[PDB]
Design a protein around this ligand. Structure first.
Ligand SMILES: Nc1ncnc2c1ncn2[C@@H]1O[C@H](COP(=O)(O)OP(=O)(O)O)[C@@H](O)[C@H]1O
Ligand SMILES: Nc1ncnc2c1ncn2[C@@H]1O[C@H](COP(=O)(O)OP(=O)(O)O)[C@@H](O)[C@H]1O
Ligand SMILES: [Mg+2]
Ligand SMILES: [Mg+2]
Lengths: 138, 470, 25, 54, 138, 190, 138, 467
């Protein structure tokens, strides 16, 4: 949190580029982006100081393209290219259990599935608090 | 025949200055000095010999002062019968690694719509094999179809089953366009159409052409692939007197892509952060998908509804352009009924007593009336228990619950999920099964016998086995 | 006309206690 | 003897329930009105801010 | 929908001027405006592209004055002027039955009554689905 | 201030401006009194205050115009005062109906000098600047009867809400940032 | 009301200085501000015409300082400084008894106690209508 | 070093033009020709030999053309062992009318956060004598603590109770920083600290230092006081080996004061009128209050929520900088339960079986489950009534209503206006008292006997009197 905004904006791609090395040499790898919600605030801060017009909630006009080009780099290669693979597990935080906000709806429509966690199940002794009635895997 | 220089690069918008001639709006420009091919499209004239353009690929590596050439015409792509069984780009380049596309003709992706005196007035039914669609909202030949729904309700599976049922039994050709979707599914469809024999790698008897632009592309490309997709189909409609099919996946990305560059072009935003030119831009494209007097086009389009809100300006201004709508809902899907079609929110234009007869019309209206009456009884049951109701109300509820189950059906492309083999039902059995349940000839059977079956003859055979195993 | 007007089936659309209580019975 | 007392008790219970419902629907309306005004003000500020930056 | 905005903005006045010919020559006429909302959208587009200040829901400040002029030209004339007539039936579409949006509140305040149509009455057999409770003619 | 009823010029002896200022601190009355109208229910349960403001909640079909004309008659009989009517954002058809309805009751006379009401109209098909100044035109007429003749007057206003809306459109036209819920920043001072 | 906004914005400080005269000369005084909400409204009017960024309820972000300065000038001096005093009683109006709004909560975090007047007690007859449960003095 | 000229004055922002020797960012400047010292801080380099600054005092009486002089270094304040028992201000000038402060060295306000290799990862427990905190969300040593609450709900009473219970027995030093609050409370604190004996005016045995800037100061000053407190907090940690307690009152005013100048600096507002740089400048300040391999610092901070809203951008980014959270509610305070701590919204990092033990963890999870279950029956009770429930539901309702009462407690600092006596409970008695209630041993007592008492033994006696 003490680093400059451009470093927080650049961090996930720098890790995806390190993950891609194993994928192209017949090996398998796993990557985790903790709190993707905190990259968008740094992108919004960096863009506003460059005198670009704001949008909804002053987010830039293309926050969808910020994550769409990132989450498309995980794939399973066939035997002509080696057979490697790369897996992704993003993380998102919601305010007061509101899943119909701006940022979460963008990232829900990109991935292949989601796991839902709730507080009421957490306090009723169900730990880990996975809601099996809504979690899916395509 | 003109040459310019790059003077500004901001985001995905570039500005070029010309010293000899000024190209008109909607022209293609080519950048000099790159290993790949980069194409720019003119948008505005800023005065003092300058234009503002939009890029069709990445803009990294550009340098101020770099030379740019002028082609002299809008984007042109190959067209003809040699593009069957091939995958091409937004600007018409093969991406399947099989060599160049050798045709004899080219077309421009920017045209104008047909006039008033070329429209046709014809309506005939098109049977598909699905009970809900064939009973409550029939389709028509040479019509426009929309599939509204949220995220994760089943648009893609339905549009795959429509292909599997209608496309294979069709004499003519077909076109598929993918706009702003996953690449992983575009890998699945290609290998699915090879096993079925629709696409052939050895003979010359293919029947489908493919155009793809996905969600890993800059906003410039994602806002043009649809025009490239429909330009191909216009050739098979006009230059040859044949019927064509056209499938489009998530036409919603055509509008979202245009909202990511409007601010950089110097515009004041409209409501909920949309560009002020939404309706006009949508109308210009939609008017070209029609069945004129020289040919027929039957189109199926999938539409995405953000956060299950049907009052959003993107889906709101799309209802006017269609002839039949199907609305998918999340509440029905949580009960386990697939396909999750909302029976009280779907409409069609040929649902008239003079086109489909009187029996077919009365059965559908009778179903809808009892489904509407079911809702009002659920308020009473909340306060006073189920057993205090009168016997007539209990009979009404029992019939309504059985009607609800019988609308579900196992598909053939979903054998991995459900684990059952698919079914197809003709129209007469669809009418007769609901007419018999409305009459009251099956009041002595449990509900579970009407779940995930085909015709009415299988429910009693399921109930007999259930009785035997008890 | 200006105020909030309810309809049919509003009890089971909110998904509160009464909706699930209604469903289980 | 028993039937009359049962009926006379049910009437009172059904009166108190409607009193409570009438009490709840009065606070919910005020909350609704406040939220309705706030949404309009928030959506107007964005248009003004995006018009000023050009 | 394929025509330019100014044509969709000029269309109703051109049709009213044709009907005003009968009113001044002792005859009677009747005119129907379909989708008065789309004219307002077409008018908003030009004002947003001409750099005029926006307002509530990005509509310009003289949108009420745009519709008040159009609907004030229907009248009944006395005998000295011939005795003609002109009657109008505008149409307006609402979202989720909300009658407190910007444009419906403007148009409701100008005319002399309303005919309300609903969808719940449509599926229980009452066709045409007219709601007599919320309909009036002064 | 020009006639729109096709009867000729309004030949008077003096003219006045519509922009003025409120009376000073030393000209106010330090007591409160009651204006008696002659209607049992109003004079018994909700008495009117002399030099005050009254809010009339109502609509159509409940006899509003008859009450207006009865007040006009009673104040002229029991005290000797005149009245002024101002229509802000007025429909033409209802204004014609009102004009013809006032003639037969007797509050307006077309044959001699016995009239009691003066009418000022601002209609719906006029630009917003015109619909925001009609009320001051209707107030300036009554200030003459108050100051140059020393009598009591009654003033009616068609709708006080359209007076706010018309003033809200002018600020948007002049290019000023809107206040809460899309009103003008000067809502309270206007 | 007829006076201009800056005159309705300067008024309280002018009275505060006249009150402060006595405090520094070994005397006691009392001051009563009739309505600070109208001053807040006037200051908001002044701010918007200067084209400053609006915030919550279109109020500027310096509303807190505007009252924080004013209500900190009432104190009790010690013996070495004379022994004078100055007491203040501000008055604020609420809508439908909403005490969780912006200005009412802002002011509560400044004063040293509050008196609540209810309307139901006023209607039923209890006058003065003071809610003993909520009123407090520190 | 060099001289400039004032070119523009708007509010609290002043621009200066230098002929030669352009000063770097974050340096201090002095104004010439004033009765009282006035200092400016450089913020931006505009161009054409001009800078934009921020004032730390009132700017009335300034004229274009006036002279400004350069210093050559950031703001420096006296730091050392002789600041104990004194009162300072933003720029380190004594306001306690007792003469100058004679220390040996000085230090600059602006510095950088500790590196990654200096962190410590030890965890322990701290006992406060309050039942809710110890049972549900216990604190720790060398950690960060935050107190959330609206207006009028009682944050500062809790801060003074924590001071009274913990500060007195501590062996190390303490620092209190007050930002944007009432002055009379500071005067009360100073006089009561004189009376207790923490501050001694005739020798060198004081164990607290005070820094104040209140709500009567211009926004330039209120944006910089917390760093002035942080510097004197850090000196006792680095140069000397000591354990330090730091109390900050309403750190929210640090954020609000920064948005009053953002518009004047020429920026585009982001959301709800806040400045675009809201998270980075908070992260810069917060990362310095830590525990390293040279000492320890324990932080207690009070936070404010505007219009009782927890989703506001200001208090919603402070949750990620804390190790323990305590949330206060107005609805609980309406029912008369003090302290008004929400038991279903407070967390701590050391609530695991391997640190606090198995028995404590089981008791806490049981009481939280019982509290959660009773909340899901509210809709049915509010309309249909109690008679519709079965026996088990009535039993759970009675036990939850009994448990709610026992969480309240009387404080010693509130005895003056409540007519009670303060209490202080050990941990074992709380654990055992909640076990006994969970086991149903007291189902024959009225629910009004568990109200405003200490240990469980006082409930049976009050019930016995109230026969
Ligand atoms: N018979 C069925 N028809 C449609 N969807 C089904 C069926 N059975 C299960 N499903 C589930 O519905 C989901 C719909 O996926 P998909 O069509 O990709 O969503 P979207 O409509 O957003 O594209 C699938 O992940 C699948 O698990
Ligand atoms: N533990 C307590 N016991 C009794 N009253 C309390 C308690 N805590 C707060 N209060 C009430 O709250 C008031 C003080 O609130 P305060 O602590 O100043 O709130 P804040 O810290 O939010 O400014 C007192 O007048 C008192 O009535
Ligand atoms: Mg899909
Ligand atoms: Mg406090």
């Amino acid at each position: 949190a003490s680093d400059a905004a451009p470093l927080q904006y650049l961090a996930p791609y720098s890790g995806c580029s390190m993950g891609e090395y194993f994928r192209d040499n017949g090996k398998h790898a796993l990557i985790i982006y903790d709190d993707l919600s905190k990259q968008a605030v740094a992108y919004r801060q960096m863009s506003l100081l460059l005198r670009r017009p704001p949008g909804r909630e002053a987010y830039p006009g293309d926050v969808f393209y910020l994550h769409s080009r990132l989450l498309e780099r995980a794939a399973k290669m066939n035997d002509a290219f080696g057979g490697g693979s790369l897996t992704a597990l993003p993380v998102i935080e919601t305010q007061a259990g509101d899943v119909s906000a701006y940022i979460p709806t963008n990232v829900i429509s990109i991935t292949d599935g989601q796991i839902f966690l709730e507080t009421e199940l957490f306090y009723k002794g169900i730990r880990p608090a996975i809601n099996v009635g809504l979690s899916v895997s395509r | 025949a003109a040459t310019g220089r790059i003077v500004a690069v901001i985001g995905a918008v570039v500005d070029v200055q010309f010293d000899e001639g000024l190209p008109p709006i909607l022209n293609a420009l080519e950048v000099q000095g790159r290993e790949t091919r980069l194409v720019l499209e003119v948008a505005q004239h800023l005065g003092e010999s300058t234009v503002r353009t939009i890029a069709m690929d990445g803009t990294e590596g550009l340098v101020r002062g770099q030379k740019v050439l002028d082609s002299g015409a809008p984007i042109k792509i190959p067209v003809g019968p040699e593009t069957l069984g091939r995958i091409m780009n937004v600007i018409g380049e093969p991406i399947d690694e099989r060599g160049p596309i050798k045709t004899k003709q080219f077309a421009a992706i920017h045209a104008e719509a047909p006039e008033f005196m070329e429209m046709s007035v014809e309506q005939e039914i098109l049977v598909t094999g699905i009970k809900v669609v064939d009973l409550l909202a029939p389709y028509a030949k040479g019509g426009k179809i929309g599939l509204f729904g949220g995220a994760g309700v089943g648009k893609t599976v339905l549009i795959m089953e429509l292909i599997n049922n209608v496309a294979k039994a069709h004499g003519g050709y077909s076109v598929f366009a993918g706009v702003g979707e996953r690449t992983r599914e575009g890998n699945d469809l290609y290998h699915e159409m090879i096993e079925s024999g629709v696409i052939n790698l050895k003979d010359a008897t293919s029947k489908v052409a493919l155009v793809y632009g996905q969600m890993n592309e800059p906003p410039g490309a994602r806002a043009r692939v649809a025009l490239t997709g429909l330009t191909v189909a216009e050739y098979f409609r006009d230059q040859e007197g044949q019927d064509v099919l056209l499938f489009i996946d998530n036409i919603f990305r055509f509008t979202q892509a245009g909202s990511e560059v409007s601010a950089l072009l110097g515009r004041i935003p409209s409501a909920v952060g949309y560009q002020p030119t939404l309706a006009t831009d949508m109308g210009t494209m939609q008017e070209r998908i029609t069945t004129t007097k020289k040919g027929s086009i039957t189109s199926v389009q999938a539409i995405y509804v953000p956060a299950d809100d049907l009052t959003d300006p993107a889906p709101a201004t799309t209802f006017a352009h269609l002839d039949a709508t199907t609305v998918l809902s999340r509440a029905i899907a949580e009960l386990g009924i697939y396909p999750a079609v909302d029976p009280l929110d779907s409409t069609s234009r040929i649902m008239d007593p003079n086109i489909v007869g009187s029996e077919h019309y009365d059965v559908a209206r009778g179903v809808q009336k009892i489904l509407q009456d079911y809702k009002s009884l659920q308020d009473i049951i909340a306060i006073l228990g189920m057993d205090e109701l009168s016997e007539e109300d209990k009979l009404t509820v029992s019939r309504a619950r059985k009607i609800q189950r019988f609308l579900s059906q196992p598909f053939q492309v979903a054998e991995v999920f459900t684990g059952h083999l698919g079914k197809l039902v003709p129209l007469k059995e669809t009418i007769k099964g609901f007419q018999q349940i409305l009459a009251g000839e099956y009041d002595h059977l449990p509900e579970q016998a009407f779940y995930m079956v085909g015709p009415i003859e299988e429910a009693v055979a399921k109930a007999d086995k259930l009785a035997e195993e008890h | 006309p200006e105020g909030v007007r309810s309809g049919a089936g509003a009890v089971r659309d909110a998904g509160g206690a009464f909706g699930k209580k209604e469903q289980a019975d | 003897e028993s039937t009359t007392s049962e009926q006379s008790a049910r009437m009172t219970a059904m009166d108190n329930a409607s009193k409570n419902a009438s009490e709840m629907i009065d606070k919910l309306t005020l909350t609704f009105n406040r939220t309705r005004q706030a949404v309009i003000t928030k959506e107007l500020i964005e248009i003004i801010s995006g018009a000023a930056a050009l």
